């Protein structure tokens, strides 16, 4: 039973990752073939860059605005920038815009989507000028909808580029997002790559490589079938036709945390296709605190638990080649359930052989994944992704359980946020202590016991030397991405 379980875990997890790697390679080959047909200085899709933020660092907001202004795409309509402000503390952030683009900030008294005439002409009168909208604070969906209306005002706009407030775009990060929209008539949305730049703290570095894996191996595989489930928040283009069609149903959803997931699922439900372009890069920061990361992950997992049913229900709309979407959703559910069941069974049946074999198998699977990541990114630091196998067991599984319990129920705030996490940590510690107490003997004459002790000690040495390598990298500042070094230098200069 245990041997079969740990054998399945290693062919059911590494096998699908190999399949995703192959599909991602095929998708990248297809995109390279498309790009090789792109003529020089190509620009045929008028875009309207949309930036929506609530309370961002003035430095990071200025960097994002300057990065948008640095884009080399030769066909941009405007820079509709919606801010959930209209307050004294938030006005300062809008001032950043006034020192980067212009003093064309507008202060409408009402939010467009909560108005009787939800049309762009109520706020803006001139469509040929960059505009900053200081609408009342209601959320990100409301500001994105106001941006959608202001973009749809222009009859010459064919696409809309959505960017987070603190996303430092690359130079060709607009040309490579909106190009695939013209490659196929069926493609109505494109998701660009988002790379973490603040890779200094351990959690931030592990999350950076999780982002890289999820965008290059998990989103590319879906992009091969043109069924990307979630367009990246920091960067993504939408055709103006599909956004005009789905801006009404996406809003008034009956609600606050999905944001881009519901938009992408709407594009899927309409029957259209979404691709992913790894050649378009947008840098964004990652959470550093473990508690804040757990809160963010439980919000994301609540949104995922809400949207997986709508994603599954739209798999028939795509007919054939839509089996991959339903299979991916089913695999996502069964992976978490199988991990929980296998680890609970292993903890309950305190066998040192099974526990050590499970640890070694998981470490080897993560090592193979990180090896492919290092090959793909041409970066050795990708092997730090091995340590990410800790985060999934301490910051993700409790997040999944908390999201499931909150969805099932549909100092109290602390208990609602951190009580399954603390209970999970106490349970893991208790399982370890019970395994140590029960299996408290030393028999250096059994091959099986020799294997168990040698394996656990070698794994401990492996993670210790990986952590030592990370520590010497941090003190050497080798871990910092070049963008992080540039941003730190410029912030110190200020």
């Amino acid at each position, epitope marked *: 039973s245990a041997v079969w379980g740990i054998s399945v875990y290693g062919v059911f997890v590494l096998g699908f990752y190999i399949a995703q790697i192959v599909f991602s390679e095929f998708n990248r080959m297809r995109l390279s073939d498309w790009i090789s047909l792109r003529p*020089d200085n190509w620009n045929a899709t008028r875009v309207a860059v949309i930036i929506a933020g609530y309370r961002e660092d003035p430095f990071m907001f200025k960097k994002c605005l300057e990065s948008v*202004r*640095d884009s080399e795409y030769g066909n941009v309509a405007r820079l509709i920038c919606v801010i959930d402000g209209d307050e004294e503390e938030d006005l300062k952030m809008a001032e950043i815009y006034k020192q980067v683009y212009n003093d064309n900030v507008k202060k409408p008294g009402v939010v467009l989507c909560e108005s009787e005439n939800k049309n762009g002409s109520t706020i803006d009168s001139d469509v040929s000028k960059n505009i900053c909208i200081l609408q009342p604070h209601r959320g990100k969906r409301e500001s994105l909808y106001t941006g959608f209306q202001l973009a749809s005002m222009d009859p010459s706009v064919h696409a809309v580029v959505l960017i987070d407030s603190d996303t430092v775009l690359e130079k060709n990060a607009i040309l490579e997002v909106v190009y695939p929209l013209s490659c196929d008539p069926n493609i109505k949305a494109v998701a660009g790559e988002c790379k973490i730049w603040n890779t200094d703290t351990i959690l931030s570095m592990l999350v950076s490589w999780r982002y890289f894996s999820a965008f290059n191996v998990e989103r590319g595989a879906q992009s091969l079938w043109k069924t990307v489930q979630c367009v990246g928040g920091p960067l993504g283009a939408y055709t103006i036709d599909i956004i005009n069609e789905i801006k009404d149903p996406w809003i008034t959803q009956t609600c606050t945390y999905g944001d881009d997931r519901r938009l992408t699922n709407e594009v899927l439900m309409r029957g259209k296709k979404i691709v992913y372009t790894p050649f378009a890069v947008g840098w964004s920061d990652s959470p550093t605190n473990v508690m804040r990361y757990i809160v963010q992950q439980t919000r994301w997992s609540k949104s995922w638990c809400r949207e997986i049913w709508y994603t599954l229900g739209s798999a028939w709309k795509h007919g054939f080649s839509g089996i991959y979407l339903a299979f991916e959703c089913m695999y996502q559910i069964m992976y978490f359930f199988l991990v929980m069941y296998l680890f609970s069974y292993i903890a309950i049946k305190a066998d040192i052989r099974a526990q050590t074999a499970t640890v070694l198998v998981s470490t080897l699977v993560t090592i193979i994944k990180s090896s492919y990541l290092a090959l793909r990114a041409k970066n050795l630091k990708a092997f730090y992704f091995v340590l990410y196998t800790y985060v999934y067991f301490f910051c993700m599984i409790p997040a999944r359980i908390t999201a499931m319990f909150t969805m099932f129920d549909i100092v109290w705030l602390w208990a609602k946020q951190f009580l399954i996490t603390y209970m999970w940590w106490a349970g893991v510690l208790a399982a370890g202590v019970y395994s140590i107490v029960d299996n408290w003997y030393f028999d250096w004459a059994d091959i099986q016991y020799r294997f168990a002790l040698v394996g656990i000690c070698s794994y401990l040495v492996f993670v210790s030397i990986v952590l030592v390598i990370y520590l010497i990298g941090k003190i050497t500042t080798w871990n910092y991405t070049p963008l992080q070094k540039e941003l730190i230098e410029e912030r110190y200069l200020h």
Partner: nanobody, 112 residues
Framework: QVQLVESGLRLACAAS????????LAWFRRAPGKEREFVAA???????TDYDSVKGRFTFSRDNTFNTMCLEMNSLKPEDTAVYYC????????????????????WGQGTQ
């Protein structure tokens, strides 16, 4: 905040300050005492435009690495004599590329 200084036949202008890739730089000519005339324009990334009279004889080139640019008078004649100005137009107010000297807000000193 950019200061443009042009020297100089092959005229060349250096612009001190940060130039975003979306700025559009143009060369204008001022006839002796009537009004400025358009000569050429191009963004900091490509897509150059030229006047009707100036077509194929003057080539627009930008360094893109040292914030300098040059214009080549491969077929200069006494007919097209004027004072040459180099101007920057930021896409700070509008992205609409225009042929109007009033739209450009940063100007260099006239040459020749």
């Amino acid at each position: 905040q950019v200061q443009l200084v042009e020297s100089g036949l092959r005229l060349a202008c250096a612009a001190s300050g940060r130039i975003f890739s979306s700025d559009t730089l143009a060369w204008f000519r001022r006839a002796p005492g009537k009004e400025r005339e358009f000569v050429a324009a191009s963004r900091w990334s490509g897509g150059g435009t030229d006047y009707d009279s100036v077509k194929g004889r003057f080539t627009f080139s930008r360094d893109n690495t040292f914030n300098t640019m040059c214009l080549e008078m491969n077929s200069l004649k006494p007919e097209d004599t004027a004072v040459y100005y180099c101007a920057l137009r930021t896409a700070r107010d509008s992205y609409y590329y225009t042929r109007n000297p009033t739209g450009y807000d940063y100007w260099g000193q006239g040459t020749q």
